[PDB]
């Protein structure tokens, strides 16, 4: 029952590759590739493990409290101050994908939805085109 | 009014001094002849100069409390100290006192001379008061105490803090300065309590009350930001003063704090009471009773003292609220009965258009959802009829 | 059009003004942060020095008491 | 024509000022987070120093 | 509005001040700050730590004299604040820094930070009603009365030449080297060590300055005199000793005409004048050669002007009338020029008000720097 090994591996991995994972807020939108039938591509925002790292730091600090790497703490702080925006964006993307699944699983509907679908993609294009708009977000 | 001390001189010295004055000649040690050699005479002189040192120490070790007392007392205090020490040094530098020292030095009774030139804090006192004097010269705190106009009070705050900006060239104690600022806040709360007691706050109508309160919040606002400017400047000096001390507590409770809190709560009293009673200008006979609880607080609000205002006005405000609670229950139960007894839905709409602003108070607003939905299905059906009839076209 | 021009410049002014204000503000708060940090820095120094000299007093006590 | 072009440019300046403004706000808040970190450090440091201090003091004295 | 403008002539070695309109500067003292070196033991000692002015000069042995300004650039602002504050004390002016606009002399090509922080010092700690930073050459020509001509100064830490045309000081012809009086004294100290006499205390460097001020001269022929053994006149120290100088009295101020002795790629004074004149409009060269004004205390050596004439003749084109003036107030040239300039009605529009400084800031000073 030793945890210093885990604390060291945590500070290790976070300081081995999460040194750059921290402030990935600029490139808000990122296209993809998904090797499947047809090899489709989806849309993705860059905040997958970072949010859990924020929770990790808060847990170590309130829980035990170490001489937690201050650089990682401030980078977590910078992720926090931009995190809710990303949550809303990610859920919007997921709902968008779910709706596109329902829409294209039907065919008649496309005729009537065409306008709204173009509207959604109009704002999607305007959202993707820009990455990191500190003023208008 | 710091006392003054007239330092005595040996009369025989003054006799020979006046004899040197009857002719054109400067007094000197050589004029006493074989009188300097008298151990009795020199012993008398030593005793006299020792008494002088005692007297001067009585003034040089003087100091007051920078924490308590009015700020004006401190300004006048340092000025009076400069006057005292100035007259003291002119008494010291007189040729008679000089000749007494010359006699003791010729008599070699160095106890008196060294004690007269180093034990009195005079040389350091003059230095300290002259270092404090530029901040102390012409401090305009009387302007707060001059005009009752809230704008004049604000302008006085501005001139006072710009005059307090002068600390950069004075080396005055920062802790004493903070206590001086709190004394200023005591004067602030005093002047505001004076003015607002004359303005008849709870008496007057809501509009004049509002203007009064706006100017008062401007006073607090100017206090706040201008004081923060002084905080910044004090930290600027502190960064060059950190080499001396770090006893800068920086804890300031400017006296007007609970006055400010009290004003905002009384704001809410005039605001919210005024509102509810102003809505009952759309009317069962609890109107005057709401005004009674209102004036219960206008009477038992005891012309808003601070201490007892906390400790008693809490229950005063609360009491008024309890009367509004009964007023609510009666109005809500009343209106729900006039609503239930309303036989027409249009009549029911007339009661809703009879209490528009009363369907704001969440207390009232909670128990009507059922009636609301009845009206919504009415609205629903009629707009649906509009879809129908408009769906038929004008040509047909 | 010139009325719209001056309005846009008024908004520009508000941004410039409030920008200098905000820069100044955060510089004031940060100066206070420097003060708090510096105070705690000196306190840390004092605690370290007190630990050192008191451990040395304990070692001196070890020396003289063992003698 | 030139007036509307200047309106576009006036809005451009407004845009950039707002960009830099929001950026300064966020960055100064980040700097504030750094200051909070420094204070948290020194807080725990003072705690550890005081505790270790008193323990070694009193126990070697006893 | 205020009482009267106070012309405070700075200088890396000697500050000079007084009110405008005055004839001569009534208040002049060295620009150094002396704080005691020894230990206060006996009570009734010299109270107070930092000494400036005549008291610091009197009890020179106790102090550890340092300079806050070097090469016309302030190195320590605290000592400068105390010096300026001393200027406003009861020993020099007996006034307040709130009722007097301030004319401030300042050397060319200096960093912006000098004007900026100096302005902050005045308008904030002193809270003067109006500050006005200016050049020094412009003031010296105003002091002589004429209007177009170059100005060759060499104070204590700087030396430069400014070709002034009717007041417009041509900013593209101001050559400036940093070899002045104090540095000549420093090199003299090195030569005194090579003589055998050692002077290294900070309160002894001043004795080296005294020797420079009353025992050095300038050789006409720079080499012919070096190949001879002089009479080796003596010198009486304040201590009462005796120093025979020898060759260390003419080679010491030779530094100004050849900074190779100190090991530097700069130029002599003569080259500063000739380059300042030649980097100007060809239509004004004859007028500038016919009007050269000297100022600054380093232009007081024996045989200075004569050697300067010889050097300039070697560098100027043939048959061009060279004319070097040398008034009797080279130490007070910039101050007298300040007294003439600030005593005019146009000075009201020439300064910078306190209100303006609070509105714009330092940019207002750089805007209205002339
Ligand atoms: N008789 C003299 N001979 C040579 N040098 C002198 C003589 N008198 C003064 N100096 C030097 O000249 C300097 C005075 O110039 P100064 O007035 O300081 O110019 P500024 O005030 O512009 O710095 C002093 O440092 C001193 O070293």
Swiss-Prot record, chain A:
Region of interest called Interaction with DYNC1LI2, as start-end residue ranges on this chain: 1-110
Intracellular or extracellular location(s): Cytoplasm, Cytoskeleton
Record: disease: Charcot-Marie-Tooth disease, axonal, type 2O: An axonal form of Charcot-Marie-Tooth disease, a disorder of the peripheral nervous system, characterized by progressive weakness and atrophy, initially of the peroneal muscles and later of the distal muscles of the arms. Charcot-Marie-Tooth disease is classified in two main groups on the basis of electrophysiologic properties and histopathology: primary peripheral demyelinating neuropathies (designated CMT1 when they are dominantly inherited) and primary peripheral axonal neuropathies (CMT2). Cortical dysplasia, complex, with other brain malformations 13: An autosomal dominant disorder characterized by global developmental delay with impaired intellectual development. Some patients show signs of peripheral neuropathy, such as abnormal gait and hyporeflexia. CDCBM13 is associated with variable neuronal migration defects resulting in cortical malformations.
UniProt similarity note: Belongs to the dynein heavy chain family.
Name of the molecule in the record: Cytoplasmic dynein 1 heavy chain 1
Native source species: Homo sapiens (Human)
Lineage, uppermost ranks: Eukaryota, Metazoa, Chordata, Craniata, Vertebrata
Gene for this chain: DYNC1H1
UniProtKB/Swiss-Prot annotation, chain B:
Effect in UniProt of substituting residue 365 to C: In CMT2O and SMALED1; slight increased BICD2-binding
Subcellular location, record wording: Cytoplasm, Cytoskeleton
Coiled coil location: 255-278, 310-333
Family to which this protein belongs: Belongs to the dynein heavy chain family.
Disorder: Charcot-Marie-Tooth disease, axonal, type 2O: An axonal form of Charcot-Marie-Tooth disease, a disorder of the peripheral nervous system, characterized by progressive weakness and atrophy, initially of the peroneal muscles and later of the distal muscles of the arms. Charcot-Marie-Tooth disease is classified in two main groups on the basis of electrophysiologic properties and histopathology: primary peripheral demyelinating neuropathies (designated CMT1 when they are dominantly inherited) and primary peripheral axonal neuropathies (CMT2). Cortical dysplasia, complex, with other brain malformations 13: An autosomal dominant disorder characterized by global developmental delay with impaired intellectual development. Some patients show signs of peripheral neuropathy, such as abnormal gait and hyporeflexia. CDCBM13 is associated with variable neuronal migration defects resulting in cortical malformations.
Protein name: Cytoplasmic dynein 1 heavy chain 1
Residues of the full protein shown: 201 to 629 of 4646
Swiss-Prot record, chain C:
Compartment(s) where it occurs, according to its Swiss-Prot or TrEMBL record: Cytoplasm, Cytoskeleton; Cytoplasm, Cytoskeleton, Microtubule organizing center, Centrosome
Tissue: Highly expressed during early embryonic development. Predominantly expressed in kidney, undifferentiated neural tissue and developing eye.
Function: Acts as an adapter protein linking the dynein motor complex to various cargos and converts dynein from a non-processive to a highly processive motor in the presence of dynactin. Facilitates the interaction between dynein and dynactin and activates dynein processivity (the ability to move along a microtubule for a long distance without falling off the track). Predominantly recruits 2 dyneins, which increases both the force and speed of the microtubule motor. Component of secretory vesicle machinery in developing neurons that acts as a regulator of neurite outgrowth.
Subunit annotation: Part of a tripartite complex with dynein and dynactin, acts an adapter linking the dynein motor complex and dynactin. Interacts with KIF1C. Interacts with RAB6A and RAB6B; interaction is specific to Rab6.
Similarity comment: family membership: Belongs to the BICDR family.
Name this protein carries in UniProt: BICD family-like cargo adapter 1
Originating species: Mus musculus
Gene: Bicdl1
Shown stretch of the complete protein: 134 to 200 of 577
Curated annotation (Swiss-Prot), chain E:
Function: Part of the ACTR1A/ACTB filament around which the dynactin complex is built. The dynactin multiprotein complex activates the molecular motor dynein for ultra-processive transport along microtubules.
Quaternary structure (record): Part of the ACTR1A/ACTB filament around which the dynactin complex is built. The filament contains 8 copies of ACTR1A and 1 ACTB. Interacts with dynein and adapters such as BICD2. Interacts with BCCIP (isoform 2/alpha).
Keyword Acetylation: yes
Organism: Sus scrofa (Pig)
Top-level division of the source organism's lineage: Eukaryota
Family: Belongs to the actin family. ARP1 subfamily.
Main location: cytoplasm
Secretion signal span: none
UniProt keyword Cytoplasm present: yes
Protein name: Alpha-centractin
GO cellular component, one term: dynactin complex
